[PDB]
Design an enzyme around this catalytic site. Structure first.
Site, short mmCIF file in Angstrom:
data_model
loop_
_atom_site.label_atom_id
_atom_site.label_comp_id
_atom_site.label_asym_id
_atom_site.label_seq_id
_atom_site.Cartn_x
_atom_site.Cartn_y
_atom_site.Cartn_z
N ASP A 194 0.95 -1.17 0.13
CA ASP A 194 -0.07 0.09 0.03
C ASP A 194 0.75 1.29 -0.02
O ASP A 194 1.84 1.49 1.08
CB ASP A 194 -0.87 -0.10 1.29
CG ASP A 194 -2.02 0.95 1.15
OD1 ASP A 194 -2.25 1.58 0.44
OD2 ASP A 194 -2.53 0.91 2.58
N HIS B 242 -2.60 2.09 9.28
CA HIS B 242 -3.12 1.08 9.58
C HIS B 242 -2.08 -0.18 9.58
O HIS B 242 -1.52 -0.11 8.47
CB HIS B 242 -4.46 0.76 9.01
CG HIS B 242 -4.50 0.99 7.30
ND1 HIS B 242 -4.02 -0.22 6.65
CD2 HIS B 242 -4.12 1.85 6.66
CE1 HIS B 242 -3.77 0.02 5.48
NE2 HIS B 242 -4.14 1.46 5.24
N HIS C 22 -6.94 -3.58 5.82
CA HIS C 22 -6.76 -3.23 7.38
C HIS C 22 -7.07 -4.35 8.35
O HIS C 22 -7.87 -5.06 8.13
CB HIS C 22 -7.99 -2.05 7.60
CG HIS C 22 -7.81 -1.18 8.59
ND1 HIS C 22 -7.56 -1.62 9.98
CD2 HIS C 22 -7.86 0.15 8.94
CE1 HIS C 22 -7.37 -0.71 11.06
NE2 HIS C 22 -7.68 0.51 10.22
N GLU D 85 1.02 6.42 6.52
CA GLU D 85 0.46 7.41 5.83
C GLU D 85 -0.21 8.46 6.60
O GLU D 85 -0.47 8.44 7.84
CB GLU D 85 -0.73 6.74 4.71
CG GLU D 85 -1.91 6.39 5.54
CD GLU D 85 -2.92 5.68 4.41
OE1 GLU D 85 -3.00 6.13 3.38
OE2 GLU D 85 -3.42 4.56 4.85
N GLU E 58 2.45 7.61 1.47
CA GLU E 58 2.27 6.38 2.35
C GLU E 58 3.48 5.50 1.93
O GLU E 58 3.77 5.54 0.57
CB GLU E 58 0.97 5.93 1.81
CG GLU E 58 0.55 4.66 2.19
CD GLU E 58 -0.82 4.05 2.08
OE1 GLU E 58 -1.32 4.43 0.88
OE2 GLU E 58 -1.27 3.46 3.04
C1 LIG Z 1 -12.29 3.01 6.47
C2 LIG Z 1 -11.64 2.16 5.31
C3 LIG Z 1 -11.40 1.16 5.10
O1 LIG Z 1 -10.58 0.74 4.19
C4 LIG Z 1 -10.65 1.25 2.85
C5 LIG Z 1 -10.21 0.20 1.68
C6 LIG Z 1 -11.11 -0.68 1.20
C7 LIG Z 1 -11.65 0.34 -0.10
C8 LIG Z 1 -10.49 1.17 -0.62
N1 LIG Z 1 -9.53 1.15 0.53
C9 LIG Z 1 -8.11 1.59 0.54
C10 LIG Z 1 -7.70 2.02 -0.58
C11 LIG Z 1 -6.43 2.67 -0.77
N2 LIG Z 1 -5.57 2.56 0.33
C12 LIG Z 1 -6.02 2.08 1.63
N3 LIG Z 1 -5.45 2.32 2.76
C13 LIG Z 1 -6.42 1.66 3.62
N4 LIG Z 1 -7.36 1.43 2.92
N5 LIG Z 1 -7.14 1.59 1.69
C14 LIG Z 1 -11.58 0.04 6.32
C15 LIG Z 1 -11.39 -1.31 6.19
C16 LIG Z 1 -11.69 -2.12 7.22
N6 LIG Z 1 -12.38 -1.59 8.25
C17 LIG Z 1 -12.74 -0.33 8.39
C18 LIG Z 1 -12.21 0.58 7.30
C19 LIG Z 1 -12.61 2.09 7.32
MN LIG Z 2 -3.44 2.78 3.21
MN LIG Z 3 -3.25 3.68 0.21
#
Ligand SMILES: c1cc(OC[C@H]2CCCN2c2ccnc3ncnn23)c2ccncc2c1
Ligand SMILES: [Mn+2]
Ligand SMILES: [Mn+2]
Length: 363
Positions: A151, A220, A228, A253, A348
């Protein structure tokens, strides 16, 4: 042999022995009061060696990520549609990661969030949005090998008026990376990130702002096929005093804003992801059943977008997708925006909390 001018050779073929290059290796920060963490690099070796195949998978994905983003930086320009930017980036990523179902591929859709939109914007079919000279674009994309996710994100601008805003966020991210380590309180990483970001003041079109971290956006922990994994790294003070642990993988990040420093759900949704805590759910409804089978086969628990469903040849799936969201099987992740007229930036990296050292695997 060697990588072609426009990249097309998979990382796997560039390293015939199957040994992928390591990221930046760092000694852990000193144990406050002030005890050294250098002892780990000489013990921990047995524990580090046991997970070598895991670190090697993250490294292959990280090398694909580096070569894709260097390629993106060479052609990304205003005038291009957001769709063409995402498709060109993803076509290069699929080729370099040597996409092979759930074994290797794209870990989540390409974020290309603009201006006050900080995250989770990717165009859906028919989106005519064009990148502008004055835009601030957050390119956030991911690669994986056996669900070992990289990521990694950066901000793209064309107007030098945003230079100090980008420097503030980059410095805050590097601070977070330096502060991270085994037994470090997540709230301490948050306070250090905030202290650094808030030391910056910027002037954009005759208006001055203090750079503020987006308080409801955060770093995260990362799990296998799980973007996550449960632990949140805040980017402001007031967070939880929970500690980082040995063997964990984190996305470090930061997000900076000239706005309120808080995001809310806005615009049309593009990002979706199957809920990790939901087991087997029998579905008789035919279109809904079909779509869930497509998701389980192609994405599993990795995030996906509507463009990817179109690419798989799916159509008239919006109601089936809404049914999966209403059933709690899939969760929507709509664009997260600060106030209209505000500017947001992001940087990030992915880090491995190895028993011997801290590896900034994506650097
Ligand atoms: C907010 C966002 C989350 O993840 C969002 C994810 C999934 C869709 C896109 N996405 C992305 C994209 C790019 N980079 C990222 N870094 C972290 N997530 N992330 C959650 C996941 C689990 N529980 C609670 C969460 C609350
Ligand atoms: Mn992320
Ligand atoms: Mn990301």
């Amino acid at each position: 042999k060697v990588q072609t001018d426009p990249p097309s050779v998979p990382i796997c073929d560039l390293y015939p022995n199957g040994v992928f290059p390591k990221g930046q290796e760092c000694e852990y920060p000193p144990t406050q009061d002030g005890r050294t963490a250098a002892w780990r690099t000489t013990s921990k070796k047995a524990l580090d060696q046991a997970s070598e195949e895991i670190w090697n998978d993250f490294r292959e994905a990280a090398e694909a990520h580096r070569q894709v983003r260097k390629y993106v930086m060479s052609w990304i320009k205003p005038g291009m549609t957001m769709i063409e930017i995402c498709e060109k980036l993803e076509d290069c990523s699929r080729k370099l990661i040597k996409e092979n179902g759930l074994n290797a591929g794209l870990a989540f859709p390409t974020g290309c969030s603009l201006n006050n939109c900080a995250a989770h914007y990717t165009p859906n079919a028919g989106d005519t949005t064009v990148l502008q000279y004055d835009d601030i674009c957050k390119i956030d994309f991911g690669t994986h090998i056996s669900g070992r996710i990289i990521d990694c994100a950066f901000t793209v601008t064309f107007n030098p008026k945003y230079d100090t805003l980008l420097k503030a966020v980059k410095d805050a991210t590097n601070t977070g990376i330096k502060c991270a380590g085994i037994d470090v309180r997540l709230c301490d990483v948050g306070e250090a990130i905030q202290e650094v970001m808030e030391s910056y003041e910027v002037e954009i079109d005759g208006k001055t702002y203090q750079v503020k971290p987006i308080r409801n956006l955060n770093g995260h922990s990362i799990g296998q096929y799980r973007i996550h994994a449960g632990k949140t790294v805040p980017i402001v003070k007031g967070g939880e005093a929970t500690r980082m642990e040995e063997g964990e993988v984190y996305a470090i990040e930061t997000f900076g804003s000239t706005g309120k420093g808080v995001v809310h759900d806005d615009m049309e949704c593009s990002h979706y992801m199957k809920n990790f805590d939901v087991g087997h759910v029998p579905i008789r409804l035919p279109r809904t059943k079909h779509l869930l089978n497509v998701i389980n086969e192609n994405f599993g628990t990795l995030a996906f977008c509507r463009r990817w469903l179109d690419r798989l040849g799916e159509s008239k799936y919006l109601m089936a997708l809404k049914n999966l969201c209403d059933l709690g099987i899939v969760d929507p992740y709509p664009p997260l925006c600060d106030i209209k007229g505000s500017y947001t930036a992001q940087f990030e990296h992915t880090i491995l909390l190895r028993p011997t050292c801290k590896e900034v695997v994506s650097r």
